[PDB]
Amino acid sequence: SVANSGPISILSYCGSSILMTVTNKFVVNLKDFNMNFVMLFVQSLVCTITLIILRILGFRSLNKTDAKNWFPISFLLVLMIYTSSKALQYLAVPIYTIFKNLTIILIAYGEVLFFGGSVTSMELSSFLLMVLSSVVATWGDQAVASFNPGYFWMFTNCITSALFVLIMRKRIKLTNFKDFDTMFYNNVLALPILLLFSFCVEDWSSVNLTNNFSNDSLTAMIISGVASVGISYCSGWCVRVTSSTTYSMVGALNKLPIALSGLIFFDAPRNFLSILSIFIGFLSGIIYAVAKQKKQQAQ
Amino acid sequence: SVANSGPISILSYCGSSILMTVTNKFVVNLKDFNMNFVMLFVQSLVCTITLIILRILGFRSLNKTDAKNWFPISFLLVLMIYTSSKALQYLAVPIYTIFKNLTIILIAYGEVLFFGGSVTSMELSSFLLMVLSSVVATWGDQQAVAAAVASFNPGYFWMFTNCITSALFVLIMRKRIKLTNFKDFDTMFYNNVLALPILLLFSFCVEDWSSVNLTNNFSNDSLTAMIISGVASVGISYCSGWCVRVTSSTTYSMVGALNKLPIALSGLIFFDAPRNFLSILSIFIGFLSGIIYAVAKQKKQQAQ
Numbered sequence: 227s228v229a230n231s232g233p234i235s236i237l238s239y240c241g242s243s244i245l246m247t248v249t250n251k252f253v254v255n256l257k258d259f260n261m262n263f264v265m266l267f268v269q270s271l272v273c274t275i276t277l278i279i280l281r282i283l284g285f286r287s288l289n290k291t292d293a294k295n296w297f298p299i300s301f302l303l304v305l306m307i308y309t310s311s312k313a314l315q316y317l318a319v320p321i322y323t324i325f326k327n328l329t330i331i332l333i334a335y336g337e338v339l340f341f342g343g344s345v346t347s348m349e350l351s352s353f354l355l356m357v358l359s360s361v362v363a364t365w366g367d368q369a370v371a372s373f374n375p376g377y378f379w380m381f382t383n384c385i386t387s388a389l390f391v392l393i394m395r396k397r398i399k400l401t402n403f404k405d406f407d408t409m410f411y412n413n414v415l416a417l418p419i420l421l422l423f424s425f426c427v428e429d430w431s432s433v434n435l436t437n438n439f440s441n442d443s444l445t446a447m448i449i450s451g452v453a454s455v456g457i458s459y460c461s462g463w464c465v466r467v468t469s470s471t472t473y474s475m476v477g478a479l480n481k482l483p484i485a486l487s488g489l490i491f492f493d494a495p496r497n498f499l500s501i502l503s504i505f506i507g508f509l510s511g512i513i514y515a516v517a518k519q520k521k522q523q524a525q
Numbered sequence: 526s527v528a529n530s531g532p533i534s535i536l537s538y539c540g541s542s543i544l545m546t547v548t549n550k551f552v553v554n555l556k557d558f559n560m561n562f563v564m565l566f567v568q569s570l571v572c573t574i575t576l577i578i579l580r581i582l583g584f585r586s587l588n589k590t591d592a593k594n595w596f597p598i599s600f601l602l603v604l605m606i607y608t609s610s611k612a613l614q615y616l617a618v619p620i621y622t623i624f625k626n627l628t629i630i631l632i633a634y635g636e637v638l639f640f641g642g643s644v645t646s647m648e649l650s651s652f653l654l655m656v657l658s659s660v661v662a663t664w665g666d667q668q669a670v671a672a673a674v675a676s677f678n679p680g681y682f683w684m685f686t687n688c689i690t691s692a693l694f695v696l697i698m699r700k701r702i703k704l705t706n707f708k709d710f711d712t713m714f715y716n717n718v719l720a721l722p723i724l725l726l727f728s729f730c731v732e733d734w735s736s737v738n739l740t741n742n743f744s745n746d747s748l749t750a751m752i753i754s755g756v757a758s759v760g761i762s763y764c765s766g767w768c769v770r771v772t773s774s775t776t777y778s779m780v781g782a783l784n785k786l787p788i789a790l791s792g793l794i795f796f797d798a799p800r801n802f803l804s805i806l807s808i809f810i811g812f813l814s815g816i817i818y819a820v821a822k823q824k825k826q827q828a829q
């Protein structure tokens with residue numbers, strides 16, 4: 227419709243990402259959770275409950291042909307989170323961001339194998355400025371046994387992150403899936419996969435978990451669940467109206483203003499290299515915006 | 526000359542750079558010289574002497590209009606060396622290579638202000654892959670830690686001045702060559718002849734001239750070594766002036782940056798020494814930069 231198109235999705239995805247970040251560190255802080263998949267299962271329950279309440283007050287659709295075709299997308303999503311968490315267990319945050327910025331390039335070249343586009347030299351220049359940014363951020367920061375665990379799990383996160391955004395955006399365009407339908411299938415079908423994943427990788431010790439996962443944590447999972455409502459709708463909107471590359475680019479660009487806020491609002495020590503990485507990352511988004519503007523007038 | 530065109534100049538500039546590197550570390554090694562400008566003055570004397578002998582056996586030209594127009598080029602050259610040496614005094618080698626790769630971008634955008642071209646998005650992609658390479662080489666290195674901010678400070682000023690003088694030199698030299706149809710033997714002659722007084726004046730201002738304390742250091746051994754390194758510099762001085770002319774100021778600075786990679790790969794192949802994956806990765810990223818830069822130039826020919 228009127229507002230379901232163009233850069234509105236980007237601005238909305240950004241705002242929803244900002245709201246989710248401030249809620250997780252100010253409202254529902256100290257969320258160093260022992261049962262992350264259970265937390266995401268409650269987050270996906272809140273999103274489903276909101277969707278059903280909003281449908282009976284006005285949207286979306288329920289099926290079984292679309293369900294068996296959407297199941298790999300939902301499986302890829304849960305596996306993407308699993309490989310990401312396992313990669314971050316052994317790998318450092320600035321290092322994780324390098325490979326996460328490297329996925330943008332294979333998502334860009336992967337979209338040429340899925341939709342038949344072309345990665346213009348200017349888009350390729352921006353992706354390189356995004357890698358440069360993540361590298362100078364790591365550069366400005368402080369054994370074979372420790373090497374291989376983190377790197378293997380990062381390689382698997384790279385392929386799952388790519389396949390997920392590429393296959394999801396393919397099915398949406400194939401089954402004329404509007405935003406609210408995409409949000410629904412992603413959260414409804416995730417519910418069993420999130421449960422099955424938690425049983426295989428998390429501890430379920432009765433009394434030792436009842437005192438930790440009490441009324442306080444339950445309230446916190448619901449509040450973080452309410453915060454995730456926007457971003458879950460917006461990510462599925464972003465991929466659809468723009469592209470899988472633009473979504474992963476906007477996602478990488480979003481980390482910069484929250485990092486700049488830490489430098490502005492909080493009296494904390496920093497090096498010039500970490501400050502430089504933020505502005506290199508900005509130049510990447512600026513020239514990526516021009517690259518898209520160039521495509522319109524050249525196609 | 527006919528075979529005085531295209532990639533032949535690049536191959537020649539590369540080979541002459543290789544010969545100069547192997548001579549300085551195998552033939553005339555232990556060249557940790559106290560009087561570097563005096564060494565370059567003998568190198569420029571050898572080049573001049575070779576040019577005069579070869580002219581009377583067969584070339585070039587002698588003038589006064591071209592001399593006052595080539596004087597800033599020769600001054601920029603000696604100043605380029607002075608700022609480079611002063612930058613390297615405070616700044617680490619992998620760090621120096623980052624800014625040296627960053628000059629390629631301002632040489633590329635500077636050539637648009639001098640010749641009126643265009644830095645195609647593909648060329649811009651290659652320059653970024655060249656910066657990426659130098660950065661991951663510095664990242665995968667621990668030689669940067671050299672020994673309060675009262676110890677490390679003037680390095681970045683001397684590096685910034687080297688960046689502008691390296692750019693201006695290659696941009697103004699190529700401009701004059703194309704203007705005065707200078708070919709190659711004239712560009713080599715005017716660079717070395719006009720450098721002679723500037724190299725002398727620079728050595729008097731920044732180097733020690735203590736009589737007996739230098740006579741025993743700068744003996745018959747060092748004199749022979751300056752002549753041999755002077756013979757090695759004959760090729761590269763002709764080829765650099767050839768490269769800038771037939772290709773471009775950007776291609777010359779790109780080929781110059783690309784040249785450091787095969788000599789580094791030779792160190793990994795020929796010599797049993799320890800290394801990290803990042804330093805190995807930087808070499809192949811640098812190769813991808815040259816490969817996509819070659820395609821970028823091939824794209825320009827069919828699109829102009």
Ligand SMILES: CCCCCCCC/C=C\CCCCCCCC(=O)OC[C@H](O)CO
Pocket residue numbers: 331345346347350647810817
């Ligand atoms: C273990 C960690 C490994 C880290 C690895 C980092 C180095 C790879 C970086 C970039 C690849 C770029 C290659 C693809 C670009 C080729 C040029 C291209 O496709 O340009 C546009 C085209 O010409 C339009 O027609």
Ligand SMILES: CCCCCCCC/C=C\CCCCCCCC(=O)OC[C@H](O)CO
Pocket residue numbers: 382426427
């Ligand atoms: C392929 C790239 C990604 C890498 C592969 C990721 C995993 C693949 C999925 C399922 C494996 C089977 C999981 C089901 C079995 C549970 C495994 C486990 O943790 O078993 C311990 C057991 O529960 C103690 O009682």
Ligand SMILES: CCCCCCCC/C=C\CCCCCCCC(=O)OC[C@H](O)CO
Pocket residue numbers: 240241244248483484485487488489491492494
């Ligand atoms: C030490 C680390 C602590 C970090 C503390 C985090 C605090 C986050 C709060 C507010 C910033 C939110 C960002 C607000 C500005 C967003 C601007 C925006 O979206 O700009 C798009 C632009 O206009 C397109 O051209």
Ligand SMILES: CCCCCCCC/C=C\CCCCCCCC(=O)OC[C@H](O)CO
Pocket residue numbers: 491492493
């Ligand atoms: C030591 C000092 C500690 C201080 C700690 C403060 C933490 C940050 C708080 C608020 C920033 C949030 C601003 C978010 C508003 C949205 C950004 C924006 O662009 O707003 C424009 C307009 O007003 C609406 O769109």
Ligand SMILES: CCCCCCCC/C=C\CCCCCCCC(=O)OC[C@H](O)CO
Pocket residue numbers: 348358362506513620623630644645646649656
């Ligand atoms: C210790 C190391 C510190 C340094 C770390 C590396 C710094 C990299 C920053 C910038 C690259 C230069 C700018 C690249 C080009 C910017 C965009 C531009 O100029 O675009 C015009 C183009 O023609 C449109 O197609």
